[PDB]
Design a protein around this ligand. Structure first.
Ligand code: HEM
Ligand SMILES: CC[C@@H]1C(=O)OC[C@@H]1Cc1cncn1C
Length: 463
């Protein structure tokens, strides 16, 4: 009655069928044998796996409510423990998601306000990139300081100074955690956390980075409590603390300190790491494909010029830039197995029985690379989202933010960030790799919870 899958052994589950260094490939290799919907055992953790566009959409959209429960990511749940928007369920999820979405809008997300903040911030990236004097540099922290400063703008009330040593520290913590969760040890941790959380190893270093990010948030919150004005909120934290006051006589309220610290931490991490990684992978992809970079320059110079900052409405007159970013996201596949979902109830799904609480892995990478939706799925080719005529061609398999009821509500900010950061860098600079185009490896360095591109250096040269 459960979907078919390979026979597990007691406790270790399907250990013998999985290579934890390549979870995505192992699962895809299993899906080739069993079909697109299968049951896998991550140790004693039973998970149903959805591969391909049709399986992912049929579950997450066509049966949206049923598949709207949140599952586990054990590394991250070490600190969160079900608190905060991302890892919450039921009433807690309803309440925090509604609040988060509305308070981000109040602070300019999808509005003129945040567009101005992003333009300013891009401005500061531009100056910082000129300041290398065309140097061969690691762009990791330049990109990530810039990106993080936007969400930090919204949640903490001010940006970080690029020279701030504590800022760099947090960014290393973030990079560190995503790194770990995409290593074989990270993925074994997903299978055997109840043992491994008590064992020395890279787990312990990852928990310590998570604890450092937690301590920094709770000290930012403590500061806000001590200085709050209930009639003029400075930031997201302020808004949340005001609601905590209004709610202190509701006995069943989800608005309390632990949910504030953990939601704020979801936002800070969310709004920092994915867009940053996307950009870094982006500049690698473009350096590997000079023909695509040249076509980008052409369009920016024609539609925008050189005399001003790019804006968000510029998107509508720029078919090719939209297709490069969509293709960057589709190739990049930054979060390849989504965040895990779970069935809210005993559930019937295309002739299988899913008991209440069964964890579900929507293989977003299998949709981004579904050969029914994309011609040569393993090639970076911006034409994947283009008319024969050259107009922007959408895709139902374009799913890097997932779909359904618990879909990324950061999509709006991220899309605005990607566009303005990519064009404003492209307008002001051309990209020059440390090796020739043919010797650049664009294959990932780590794939697990995230797709992590290889360490590289590059140069930014003015036009
Ligand atoms: C390149 C950019 C981004 C990518 C690829 C991405 C990807 C994802 C994915 C795959 C999920 C899981 C959704 C699901 O379970 O169906 C998610 C959820 C989430 N994301 Fe993002 N995201 C991005 C940007 C952002 C930004 C900028 C923020 C914060 C401003 C953010 C915050 C969140 C939050 C809070 C959730 C939890 C949704 C929920 O459980 O209700 N993300 N994102
Ligand atoms: C594993 C959950 C991570 C967290 O703490 O909150 C969001 C984050 C994952 C994520 C979702 N959207 C972008 N990111 C980087």
């Amino acid at each position: 009655k459960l979907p078919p899958g390979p026979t597990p052994l007691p406790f270790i589950g399907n250990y013998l069928q999985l290579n934890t260094e390549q979870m995505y490939n192992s699962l895809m290799k299993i899906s080739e044998r069993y079909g697109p919907v299968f049951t896998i055992h991550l140790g004693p953790r039973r998970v149903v796996v959805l591969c391909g566009h049709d399986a992912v959409r049929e579950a997450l959209v066509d049966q949206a409510e049923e598949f709207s429960g949140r599952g586990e990511q054990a590394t991250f749940d070490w600190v969160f423990k079900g608190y905060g928007v991302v890892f919450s369920n039921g009433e807690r999820a309803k309440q925090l998601r509604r609040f988060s979405i509305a308070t981000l809008r109040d602070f300019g997300v999808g509005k003129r306000g945040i567009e101005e903040r992003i333009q300013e911030e891009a401005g500061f990236l531009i100056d910082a990139l000129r300041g290398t004097g065309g140097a061969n540099i690691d762009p990791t922290f330049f990109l990530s300081r810039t990106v993080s400063n936007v969400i930090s703008s919204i949640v903490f009330g001010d940006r970080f100074d690029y020279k701030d040593k504590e800022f760099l520290s947090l960014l290393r913590m973030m990079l560190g955690i995503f790194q770990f969760t995409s290593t074989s040890t990270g993925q074994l941790y997903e299978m055997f956390s109840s043992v491994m959380k008590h064992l020395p190893g890279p787990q312990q270093q990852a928990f310590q980075l998570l604890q450092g990010l937690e301590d920094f948030i709770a000290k930012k919150v403590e500061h806000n409590q001590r200085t709050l004005d209930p009639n003029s909120p400075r930031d997201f934290i302020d808004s949340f603390l005001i609601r905590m006051q209004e709610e202190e006589k509701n006995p069943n309220t989800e608005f309390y300190l632990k949910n504030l610290v953990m939601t704020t931490l979801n936002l800070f991490i969310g709004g920092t790491e994915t867009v940053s990684t996307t950009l870094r992978y982006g500049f690698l992809l473009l350096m590997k494909h000079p023909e695509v970079e040249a076509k980008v320059h052409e369009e920016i110079d024609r539609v925008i010029g050189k005399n001003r900052q790019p804006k968000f409405e510029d998107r509508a007159k720029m078919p090719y830039m939209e297709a490069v970013i969509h293709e960057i996201q589709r190739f990049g596949d930054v979060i390849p197995m989504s965040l895990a979902r779970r069935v809210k109830k005993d559930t019937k799904f295309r002739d299988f029985f899913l008991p209440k609480g069964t964890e579900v892995y929507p293989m977003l990478g299998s949709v981004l690379r579904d050969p029914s939706f994309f011609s040569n799925p393993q090639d970076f080719n911006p034409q994947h989202f283009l008319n024969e005529k050259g107009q922007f061609k959408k895709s139902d398999a374009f799913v890097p933010f997932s779909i359904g009821k618990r879909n990324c509500f950061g999509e709006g900010l991220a899309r605005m960030e990607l566009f303005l950061f990519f064009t404003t860098v492209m307008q002001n600079f051309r990209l020059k790799s440390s090796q020739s185009p043919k010797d650049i490896d664009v294959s990932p360095k780590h794939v697990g919870f995230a797709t992590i591109p290889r360490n590289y250096t590059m140069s930014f040269l003015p036009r």
